[PDB]
Write a protein that binds this ligand. Sequence first.
Ligand SMILES: [Mn+2]
Ligand SMILES: [Mn+2]
Lengths: 205, 205
Amino acid sequence: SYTLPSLPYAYDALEPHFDKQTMEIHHTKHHQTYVNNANAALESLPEFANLPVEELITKLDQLPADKKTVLRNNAGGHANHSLFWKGLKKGTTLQGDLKAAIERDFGSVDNFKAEFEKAAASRFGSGWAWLVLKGDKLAVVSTANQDSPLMGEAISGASGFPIMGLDVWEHAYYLKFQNRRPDYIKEFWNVVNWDEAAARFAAKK
Amino acid sequence: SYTLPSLPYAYDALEPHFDKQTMEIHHTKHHQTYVNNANAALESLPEFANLPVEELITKLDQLPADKKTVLRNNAGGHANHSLFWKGLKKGTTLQGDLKAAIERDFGSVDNFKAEFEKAAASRFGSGWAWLVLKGDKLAVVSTANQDSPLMGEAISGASGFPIMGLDVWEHAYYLKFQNRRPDYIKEFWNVVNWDEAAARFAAKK
Ligand SMILES: [Mn+2]
Ligand SMILES: [Mn+2]
């Protein structure tokens, strides 16, 4: 039984970058729905229901053929948004090991940002832009809908351990930005939680 | 080169069903961008640039590998939205041979509406819900992002001649309905142009 996590901050804690109205709807309506549908799909699968959502999405091919898609979509949605909320915070600073790794793997922070922005803006339709750790190297990848790199290349077209990510489904930015996804992407730099990103980069698991 | 077609009515002609602000943005920003992106990719393809968009999406497999996805997405977007605007109109009535065909193929108008509503709601992520004519029979199907049944089954996962369609990308309904897509789908019944659908059904292609 998956529980919708509470946000680690107020709905307007990311203002003036991400709007409070969207933060509320995004959490209480969209995430709520993924949790509901994932839970409904796992009702007849107690063997899989006890696994953490992050582990479940790595075992999608282990599910009954008729449960793969519904759980890929909703367990993926739950896993992705849970990471999203924790990966957002104002006032942090990229530094330490993670900053060194980005400069090492991308040449510079600006280099990395340009590549991330490209992935985020070029994601056609619904999806996510990610900064992942593929073994020893950091990389920028994107996925469609609620797919996660944790699902593997065969399913998601991407792979690696997510360090941080940006939701580019239109519901994530339409109320305030409408079609202006690039403005939303720029604002993201102001709220991406480098402290949590650093924590994940340290864990690597 | 492609050009953004003018709407067949004022931006507020679909009120109180589809909001005027969305009609404006959807047309002048979203549709415009597909036209812009398609033209940019076709600049270097004089042998394809002269083709009507509806014809171009039937030959995506003929394009250079590096041009297939960008044109599938943008030429698809242009073709889809062009159909969409003409497929909307207030005050129409589903009747004639189209209605009889719907009743024959789905058992009843209400049965058809339920199936269309289901397909429209079940399209996960960005996409379209379609009423298509194939094998001389009407059927409900959905496609991802800007894919069209006219692109064929291999690419779009669907086939047939579109009679009418509903855009379920979040930008099409978020301003007024937010996450409540089913409500948006219900309102669609109030603006779906049965006259144009009937004309398309008559022509058969
Ligand atoms: Mn989201
Ligand atoms: Mn659209």
